[PDB]
């Protein structure tokens, strides 16, 4: 009631280091929290669902924005069989000169990552042809997360 | 050969500072005065924490951004011409 595990006094009383471990472990187990009832459990579940939806929408918005900004969608749609898709750029202080030289793939001006997720083909099929569409989708998904 | 008493528990359980010294300050008074005068702003805890975090972040970001391509290989950029993929991909 005083230490970090505010949802369980027994985990807060003991002075060893297992308090941290078991506080992290059982944070989502709403049935064992002290002074719990059915209403609180259901409402917490509802709020957790909303948070999870927000996280998913933010994730897909980030994917779309990064492909739009650092990718080669426009050059890919013209020659699908002879262009390697690009996921995002690479910035790394630890990279040496041969690493920078070897990782420069596609038509980019620096190191990139080839995308094996396959979102390029999906977005091409559903009817997107320019980066403006991807930027618009990113903004829309940001609004949905908000 | 008695090693336990109830009046004073300091020596019973062993609350000793083995290497504690109580000699007066051997530093020069002028040196101490100068250092005390010039170390005043860093005494507070929260202000020191905020200053350290903010200054470290700002300095690290500025050094990373301003640094040219000679120090950082990643800031030089590629030089050799690009090569094709296995099956003729670009």
């Amino acid at each position: 009631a005083l230490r970090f595990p505010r949802f369980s006094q027994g985990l807060a009383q003991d002075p060893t280091t297992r308090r941290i471990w078991f506080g992290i472990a059982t944070a989502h187990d709403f049935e064992n929290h002290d002074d719990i009832t059915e209403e609180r459990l259901y409402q917490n579940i509802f709020a957790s669902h909303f948070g999870q939806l927000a996280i998913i929408f933010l994730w897909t918005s980030g994917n779309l924005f990064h492909v739009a900004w650092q990718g080669n969608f426009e050059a890919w749609v013209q020659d699908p069989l002879h262009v390697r898709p690009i996921a995002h750029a690479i910035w790394d202080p630890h990279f040496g000169q041969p690493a920078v030289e070897a990782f420069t793939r596609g038509g980019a001006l620096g190191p990139v990552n080839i995308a094996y997720s396959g979102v390029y083909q999906w977005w091409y099929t559903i009817g997107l042809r320019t980066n403006g569409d991807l930027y618009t989708g990113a903004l829309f998904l940001l609004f949905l997360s908000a | 050969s008695v090693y336990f008493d109830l009046e004073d528990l300091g020596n019973t359980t062993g609350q000793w500072d083995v290497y504690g010294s109580d000699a007066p300050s051997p530093y020069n008074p002028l040196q101490s005065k100068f250092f005390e005068t010039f170390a005043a702003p860093f005494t507070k805890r929260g202000l020191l924490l905020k200053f350290l975090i903010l200054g470290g972040g700002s300095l690290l970001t500025y050094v990373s951004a301003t640094s040219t391509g000679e120090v950082l290989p990643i800031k030089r950029g590629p030089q050799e011409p690009p090569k094709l993929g296995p099956r003729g991909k670009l």
């Binding site: 005083l2 970090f4 | 924490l49 972040g57 690290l60 970001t61 990373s64 951004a65």
Partner: peptide, 30 residues
Amino acid sequence: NNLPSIFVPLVGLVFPAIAMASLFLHIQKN
């Protein structure tokens, strides 16, 4: 442009340092 040169150090170092300091302080606080 050079946005990565500014943003990568912030996410890599400064923000984790702030998060670790805050979390440790909140964990040990009575």
